[PDB]
Amino acid sequence: GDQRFGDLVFRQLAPNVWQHTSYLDMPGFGAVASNGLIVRDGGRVLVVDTAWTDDQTAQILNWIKQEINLPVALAVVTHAHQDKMGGMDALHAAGIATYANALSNQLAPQEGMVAAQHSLTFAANGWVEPATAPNFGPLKVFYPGPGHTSDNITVGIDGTDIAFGGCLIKDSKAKSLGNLGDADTEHYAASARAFGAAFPKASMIVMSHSAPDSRAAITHTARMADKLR
Ligand SMILES: Cc1c(CP(=O)(O)O)c2ccc(N3CCCC3)cc2n(CC2CCCC2)c1=O
Ligand SMILES: [Zn+2]
Ligand SMILES: [Zn+2]
């Protein structure tokens, strides 16, 4: 059930959850799909990840306006790369409170990203320090450890079977682990499984560059990561 809205695709995953998809024509490799989430929490909307660009991100807000018609209370972005943080200005222009890993906001300038307004910090166990993620409601935010990037974070939705690995997790039939230029070879496998252990009740794993999968994605990604050991 893919709904086309301008150059973006929206798919309902569950009663209060949609997957937003945006495309960037990358030279030689084609038009790359990137996924985030839109979660209705009672009388407000929560956004996970921007589109690639400000224009695309503004089309997510246009879609929310038409299809939900409630204020976007906050957005959380899963690491400091264009597919996840490219549209930060569009969120700020819309007056939306924005949250990222402290380290994402630290990296954002040199990555050519605009920093989120607010910084998340994580306890030893990797769960977000609740003080830093206020009014997140059903969004459960977890730092699995260094993987796809050193600053990558994951999000589960309470009252839902859905967990989001971002660019850390690839689908169960994936060939490679993709871009590893900013990756941590050592702890990737561990981080991939820490995400799995953090959301064990999650039967639908949403990820950046594939349609939603089974938990096989996590094991498959972790198993492919174990070759980097
Ligand atoms: C940041 C980044 C991404 C997004 P992410 O998956 O790393 O989050 C990317 C995402 C996808 C991608 N092709 C998709 C199929 C296989 C590879 C390449 C990506 N390249 C490398 C390009 C930079 C300019 C020319 C090559 C990236 O630099
Ligand atoms: Zn990335
Ligand atoms: Zn990615």
Q: Which of 27, 205, 140, 167 is nearest to 85 (CA)?
A: 167
| Ligand 1 neighbours (beta carbon < 6 A) | 26, 29, 32, 81-83, 167, 178-179
Nearest CA owner, ligand 1 atom 28: 179
Q: Where are the beta strands (DSSP E) in 78-203?
A: 97-101, 118-120, 139-142, 154-157, 162-164
Known binding residue 148? Answer is: yes
Element at 216 (helix H, strand E): helix 216-225
CATH number for position 173: 3.60.15.10
Q: What token pair was written down for 144?
A: 């699995």
How remote is the CA of residue 130 from the centroid of ligand 3, in Å?
27
Q: Helices 216-225 & 188-198, crossing angle to 10 degrees?
A: 160
33, HSE (Cβ side, Cα atoms, 13 Å): 15
Q: Which domain holds residue 137?
A: 2-227
Resolution (A): 2.2
**Strand duo 162-164 + 204-206: pairing:** parallel
- Technique used: X-ray
Determine contact, residues 39/30, Cβ cutoff 8 Å.
no
The preferred substitution site among 22, 25, 32 for testing ligand 1, maximizing ligand atoms within 8 Å of CB, is 32
Q: Which of 79, 88, 28 is nearest to 52 (CA)?
A: 88
Secondary structure of the chain: what % helix, strand, coil (to 5)? 25, 30, 45
> Which atom of ligand 1 is nearest the CA belonging to 176?
16
Known binding residue 167? Answer is: yes
Q: How many domains does the chain have?
A: 1
Known binding residue 170? Answer is: yes
Known binding residue 81? Answer is: yes
Distance of CA 96 to the CA centre of its chain: 17
